[PDB]
Design a protein around this ligand. Structure first.
Ligand SMILES: [Ca+2]
Ligand SMILES: [Ca+2]
Length: 306
């Protein structure tokens, strides 16, 4: 089996991936996996797939679905990594008399254009009943986002930004920032994606990787105790906050055993984004693009007789 470069995001969600390596599940499947850490989200994950720097990427669902719907026929969504929805938290400065409610938002700080923090701002706007936001401050990283809403020097100011709850919880407790709203993703939060190159060149190995992840997920499920320790000792999460998170997340224990849920990964995602104004492409154009690049089956090895 050819070597496999897997791009991931160093968060609590990547826990199952770690234990799969710790317990040597990858090697057990005759695999040689080179993990590539991507601290700045799915945006770079897609770029890495486009440049063939990596074979597989584990990122947010909407990121890949939208990219495909926008005409990237070289991106393939293989399966679901996380079944439970992502909880987005809306934050603002510690002392902002001008910002107390979500409907008061005008300037929206985002890591990058097209990111989750950007896309979800539209979804939030639609649920609030207000028109989508048009003022965006590209701040690149999480810290800049916090400094921005606090109107700190060196960065452009913002009214609010959106970031994963448990990742932002630390800064609510030390009162650096202030939560004004939350919002779940209508869809499953994480998926496993690959490129057209890797899919036709390294299909058999990708399958084994998914199977290894399946075991990594089962181990996690049976060893939350160790998961809590790992997350709090290696990632920016307290043991208590890490524990709270474990009671909200549900990794796809059926990953590789059954096709992804079309309704939650594709239908809800496209219908929400389209309705929110994120996607301008027509429905049947989006459908046709997703029907070709979103798996409705599981990967399979060649039969003995070819
Ligand atoms: Ca195209
Ligand atoms: Ca290529």
């Amino acid at each position: 089996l050819p070597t496999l470069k897997v791009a991931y995001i160093p968060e609590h969600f990547s826990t199952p991936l770690f234990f799969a390596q710790q317990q040597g599940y990858y090697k057990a499947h005759d695999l040689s996996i080179e993990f590539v850490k991507v601290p700045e989200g799915s945006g770079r994950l897609i770029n890495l797939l486009n440049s063939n720097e990596v074979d597989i990427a584990i990122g947010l669902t909407e990121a890949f679905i939208a990219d495909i719907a926008k005409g990237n026929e070289n991106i393939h969504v293989l399966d679901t990594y996380v079944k439970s929805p992502l909880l987005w938290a809306v934050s603002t400065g510690s002392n902002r008399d001008d910002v107390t409610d979500a409907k008061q938002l005008k300037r929206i700080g985002v890591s990058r254009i097209g990111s989750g923090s950007y896309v979800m701002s539209f979804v939030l706007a639609h649920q609030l009943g207000v028109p989508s936001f048009d003022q965006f401050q590209v701040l690149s990283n999480f810290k800049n986002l916090r400094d921005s809403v606090n109107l700190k020097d060196g960065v452009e100011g913002s009214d609010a930004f959106m970031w994963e709850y448990f990742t932002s919880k630390k800064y609510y407790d030390n009162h650096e920032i202030k939560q004004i709203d939350q919002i779940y993703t209508p869809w499953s939060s994480w998926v496993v994606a690959t490129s057209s190159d890797s899919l036709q060149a390294k299909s058999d190995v990708i399958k084994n990787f998914i199977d290894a992840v399946n075991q990594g997920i089962q181990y996690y499920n049976e060893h939350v105790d160790e998961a809590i320790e790992y997350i709090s000792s290696n990632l920016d999460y307290s043991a208590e906050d890490a524990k709270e998170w474990t009671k909200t997340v549900e990794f796809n224990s059926r990953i590789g055993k059954t096709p992804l849920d079309w309704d939650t990964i594709v239908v809800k995602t496209k219908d929400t984004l389209k309705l929110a104004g994120v996607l301008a492409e027509s429905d049947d154009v989006i459908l046709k693009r997703l029907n070709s690049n979103v798996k409705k089956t599981n990967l399979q090895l060649d039969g003995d007789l070819e």
